[PDB]
Structures are given as structure tokens and as C-alpha cells.
Amino acid sequence: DPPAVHLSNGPGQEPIAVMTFDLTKITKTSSSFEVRTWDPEGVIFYGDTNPKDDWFMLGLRDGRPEIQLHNHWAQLTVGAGPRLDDGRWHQVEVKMEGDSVLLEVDGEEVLRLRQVSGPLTSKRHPIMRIALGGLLFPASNLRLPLVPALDGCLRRDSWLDKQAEISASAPTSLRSC
Amino acid sequence: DPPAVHLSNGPGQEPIAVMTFDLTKITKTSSSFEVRTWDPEGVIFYGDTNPKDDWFMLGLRDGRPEIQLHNHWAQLTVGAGPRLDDGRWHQVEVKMEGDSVLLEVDGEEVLRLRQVSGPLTSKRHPIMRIALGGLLFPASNLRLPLVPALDGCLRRDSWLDKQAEISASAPTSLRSC
Numbered sequence: 562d563p564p565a566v567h568l569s570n571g572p573g574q575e576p577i578a579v580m581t582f583d584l585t586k587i588t589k590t591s592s593s594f595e596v597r598t599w600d601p602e603g604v605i606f607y608g609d610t611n612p613k614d615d616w617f618m619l620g621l622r623d624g625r626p627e628i629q630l631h632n633h634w635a636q637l638t639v640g641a642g643p644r645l646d647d648g649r650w651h652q653v654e655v656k657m658e659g660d661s662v663l664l665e666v667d668g669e670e671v672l673r674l675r676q677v678s679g680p681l682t683s684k685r686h687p688i689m690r691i692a693l694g695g696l697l698f699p700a701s702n703l704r705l706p707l708v709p710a711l712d713g714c715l716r717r718d719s720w721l722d723k724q725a726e727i728s729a730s731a732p733t734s735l736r737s738c
Numbered sequence: 739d740p741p742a743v744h745l746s747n748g749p750g751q752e753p754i755a756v757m758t759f760d761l762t763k764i765t766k767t768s769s770s771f772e773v774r775t776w777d778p779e780g781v782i783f784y785g786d787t788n789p790k791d792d793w794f795m796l797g798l799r800d801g802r803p804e805i806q807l808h809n810h811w812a813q814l815t816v817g818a819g820p821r822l823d824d825g826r827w828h829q830v831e832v833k834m835e836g837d838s839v840l841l842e843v844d845g846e847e848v849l850r851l852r853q854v855s856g857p858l859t860s861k862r863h864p865i866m867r868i869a870l871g872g873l874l875f876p877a878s879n880l881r882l883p884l885v886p887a888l889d890g891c892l893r894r895d896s897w898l899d900k901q902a903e904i905s906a907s908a909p910t911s912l913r914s915c
């Protein structure tokens with residue numbers, strides 16, 4: 562089996578990994594991974610350039626994907642797709658394509674948020690953070706609060722553009738599944 | 739004894755802790771801690787609002803404090819103070835006072851970088867990061883490269899302003915001394 566990691570560490574709700582990227586170097590604006598869980602609710606990943614007004618979250622709520630986003634063009638809270646809380650590995654892809662954010666699950670397009678973003682490259686503060694398994698702000702600050710901990714597993718993950726990655730958090734924390 | 743933590747985890751040079759702060763809420767612009775080491779060289783802490791052009795590092799080089807800083811007003815590489823690599827606990831305080839950054843060691847003022855910063859509050863991108871025990875950029879990007887790992891210990895630490903802290907990294911990583 563390909564190497565999987567725990568999405569939560571237990572008591573605390575701090576992300577298990579944080580990656581930071583130089584925005585002027587991003588050419589690939591998609592992430593993809595595999596996820597397995599029995600948990601109906603929690604954070605799979607969070608991205609931001611600013612935690613007060615340029616941020617994105619993908620989690621589960623009622624076993625289904627949920628996207629929360631606030632940036633200059635769009636502010637939204639959307640559920641879409643099938644229940645992923647069945648203990649089977651699922652393929653997920655999040656892509657930004659033109660002004661749209663796409664969500665793919667198991668090879669199918671399940672959500673397309675159109676006209677939600679201008680070009681990254683020409684963005685207002687050129688550093689983007691990616692956190693896995695939680696937020697980089699307290700849960701009460703979401704548009705719609707959820708309890709962040711997602712007792713699940715992750716593998717085959719690839720975030721945005723490797724060539725633009727400025728830092729990656731200590732991998733001393735990671736816990737194998 | 740008050741509880742101490744390892745500044746490095748060993749193989750990797752990733753910071754052992756990352757704290758992020760809302761700049762419009764900072765009222766206390768100082769940090770202070772205690773440090774004990776036999777290591778002549780490495781990073782004690784790094785701060786930034788942007789890792790490409792608004793960043794600060796405090797480490798040791800030849801057993802002495804070294805500050806590296808690049809922001810809009812100042813770009814500099816300065817050694818000052820006594821050797822701290824003697825295996826005794828040392829008190830250190832880093833303070834910003836008006837346009838000056840002060841460095842105190844064991845209750846004495848050893849360095850004052852004057853006219854190196856305008857007001858934080860009215861700053862160009864309101865999120866500051868603090869990393870302990872390494873940088874949030876590769877070492878080759880410093881003004882003057884050093885091997886970041888500092889095999890040392892830290893206690894009684896307090897960073898900037900607690901009331902402005904947006905996130906603190908998972909404390910699952912921390913290793914007691």
C-alpha cells in the first residue's frame with residue numbers, strides 16, 4: 562500500500578501540516594489526494610493568502626464535501642457530491658481553471674464554483690498557505706462553524722505547485738495509518 | 739525546573755513551532771525567552787510578514803547573537819553581545835521601541851538597531867509569522883547563510899502579543915529537554 566497519514570492528532574485541532582508557496586511561481590493551480598474516513602464532519606484542507614479575507618476550506622459535513630470560501634469576489638458555503646464517510650478510499654481533485662474552482666470526486670465533476678477568483682499570479686499578497694487537517698484560524702471564524710477534527714487518512718497527495726513551495730512544515734508530526 | 743523544549747528535531751531544519759498574529763491587534767511588540775546551548779551556530783527564531791521582503795532572524799554565529807533583517811527600511815547582518823554557547827541558561831529579550839529594535843541579553847542592552855522599522859499597526863500586509871528554531875525559507879536565502887539547526891533548549895518564552903495570536907502550531911512536535 563502507498564503511504565497514508567492521519568488527518569488529526571486527537572485532542573487539538575491544529576493542522577497536521579502547513580505548506581507555503583510563492584504565488585508568482587505557481588503554474589499548477591490544483592491539488593489532488595485520496596481520503597478515507599468514517600467521520601461525517603471535519604476539515605480536509607484549508608488554503609489562504611490572508612486568514613481574515615482571502616481563504617478557502619474543503620471539509621465534510623453530513624459525510625459530504627463542503628467548501629467555504631471568502632475572498633474579494635465571492636463569499637460562500639456550499640455542500641456538493643456524495644457521502645465520503647463510508648471507509649473507502651476516495652479520489653478528490655480541487656482545481657482552479659480560469660475564474661472557476663472545480664471539485665472532482667472519484668473521477669466525476671460534482672461542483673464548479675464559477676467566477677469566484679481572478680488570476681492568482683496577479684494577486685494581492687503573493688504568499689499562499691495550505692494547511693492539511695485543520696484551519697489556520699479558530700473554527701468560530703468560519704462562515705458556518707464545524708468541529709474541525711477529521712479522524713481520517715490521506716495518501717497520494719500533491720498540493721498546488723511543488724516548484725513554487727517556499728516551506729513545508731516539520732514532518733516529525735505526521736502519523737502513519 | 740520550568741518546562742524546557744528542544745530547538746531542533748535533528749535531521750530536518752524545519753521550525754519546531756510557528757505562530758501567526760493579527761498585526762492590527764498587536765500592542766506588545768517584544769518577545770522574551772531563555773536559551774541554553776553548546777552549539778555555536780543556528781537559528782533561535784525567525785519572524786516575517788513576507789518571506790521575500792519583510793523578515794527577521796535571530797540566531798547564533800560563533801557562539802554570539804546575530805540578527806539578519808530585510809524589510810522596506812533596512813537590510814542588515816549584525817553580530818553583537820557575548821558568546822551564549824556555554825551551556826548556561828541565558829535571558830534574551832527582543833523589543834521594538836519606536837523605529838528601533840533592541841536586543842537584551844541577561845538583563846543588559848547589547849544591541850540597538852535604530853530606524854529599521856515604521857509602525858507595525860500601519861503595516862503592509864497585516865499577518866506576522868513567528869517561527870522557533872528555524873526559518874520559513876531555505877537557508878541559502880539569508881543575507882548571510884548559516885546552517886539553521888540549533889541543538890539547544892528553550893523555556894519561559896513569550897512571543898509578541900498573546901491577544902493578537904491567530905494560530906499556534908501543533909504542540910505534538912515539541913520535545914522536552
Ligand SMILES: C[C@]12CCC(=O)C[C@@H]1CC[C@@H]1[C@@H]2CC[C@]2(C)[C@@H](O)CC[C@@H]12
Binds near residue numbers: 607608616657678721
Ligand atoms: C482552491 C485553491 C485553488 C486550487 C487548489 O489547488 C487549492 C487552492 C486552495 C486555496 C484557494 C485556491 C483558489 C483561490 C483562493 C480561494 C484564494 O482567494 C484564497 C485561497 C485560495
Ligand SMILES: C[C@]12CCC(=O)C[C@@H]1CC[C@@H]1[C@@H]2CC[C@]2(C)[C@@H](O)CC[C@@H]12
Binds near residue numbers: 768834
Ligand atoms: C523583531 C520583531 C519585533 C519585536 C519582537 O518581538 C520580534 C519581532 C520579529 C519580527 C520582526 C519584528 C520587527 C519588525 C520586522 C523586522 C518586520 O519588518 C518584518 C519582521 C519583523
Ligand SMILES: [Ca+2]
Binds near residue numbers: 602708710712
Ligand atoms: Ca469529525
Ligand SMILES: [Ca+2]
Binds near residue numbers: 887
Ligand atoms: Ca548548529
